[PDB]
């Protein structure tokens, strides 16, 4: 855990197919769990 | 050469509607169980000086603007909703 | 139709250098026996949100700008002089 | 007096040949005396 959280955030930045809304939204999800 | 001339400076700083970044919770203070994204919004609001202590810059004409803000309820999900804000269309310098 | 879309709003409100109107006496606090005209100036300064309470918007690159301000000495005359101010060229969101 | 001060301010606004600097400057003078 935590290690997992960083990875989750990192992937969010890393993904080229999320547009701004998709990206902002996924961050919010990572926040809920983390 | 590369200095802003008085007449240019004086005009640009004088009381007028300027794009100001306003915090949403500060405008919607009743919405306590909501985080917003973006947490602030760009609004046309009065700003600048009247170049006299007897005068203050005030709005004389206001209109509305609506923006799609993300409304986040911590640990309970999120949705995009419309929210409406006041914009200043015209500013006057008037006595304090 | 006439509502600002999330992606548009979110980008425009996000931390960046914005034309801010800064008071001269607040930047030159030592100059006590001087009224200035204009009493404030338009400067590029950081503004906007980071959309997280762990982050704050800060300047990473600053430069100078010089403007011709009227320097008024009450009941003793006036002259236009150059005065120099700090401008923020670049802003980052970084941890508080 | 005073009546004179208003007139002085009024003329400042009224004059079409002062440009911004000339106009702002004259106001400062009216202030010194008034």
Curated annotation (Swiss-Prot), chains B, C:
Disulfide bonding pattern of the chain: 15-57, 46-91, 50-93
Membrane-crossing residue ranges in chain numbering: none
Tissue distribution of the protein: Higher expression in pituitary tumors than the pituitary gland.
Induction of expression: By hypoxia. Regulated by growth factors, cytokines, gonadotropins, nitric oxide, hypoglycemia and oncogenic mutations.
Positions glycosylated per UniProt: 64
Origin superkingdom: Eukaryota
Similarity remark: Belongs to the PDGF/VEGF growth factor family.
Disease: Microvascular complications of diabetes 1: Pathological conditions that develop in numerous tissues and organs as a consequence of diabetes mellitus. They include diabetic retinopathy, diabetic nephropathy leading to end-stage renal disease, and diabetic neuropathy. Diabetic retinopathy remains the major cause of new-onset blindness among diabetic adults. It is characterized by vascular permeability and increased tissue ischemia and angiogenesis.
Name this protein carries in UniProt: Vascular endothelial growth factor A, long form
Chain's gene name: VEGFA
Whole sequence portion shown: 218 to 313 of 395
């Amino acid at each position: 855990f935590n290690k997992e959280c960083l990875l989750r955030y990192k992937e969010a930045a890393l993904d080229p197919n999320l547009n701004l809304y998709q990206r902002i939204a996924k961050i919010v999800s990572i926040d809920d769990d983390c | 050469h590369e200095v802003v001339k008085f007449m240019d400076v004086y005009q640009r700083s004088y009381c007028h509607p300027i794009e100001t970044l306003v915090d949403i919770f500060q405008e919607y203070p009743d919405e306590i169980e909501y985080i917003f994204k973006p947490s602030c919004v760009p609004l046309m609001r009065c700003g600048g000086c009247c170049n006299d202590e007897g005068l203050e810059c005030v709005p004389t004409e206001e209109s509305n603007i609506t923006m799609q803000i993300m409304r986040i309820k911590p640990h309970q999900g999120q949705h995009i909703g419309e929210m409406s804000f006041l914009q200043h269309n015209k500013c006057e310098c008037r006595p304090k």
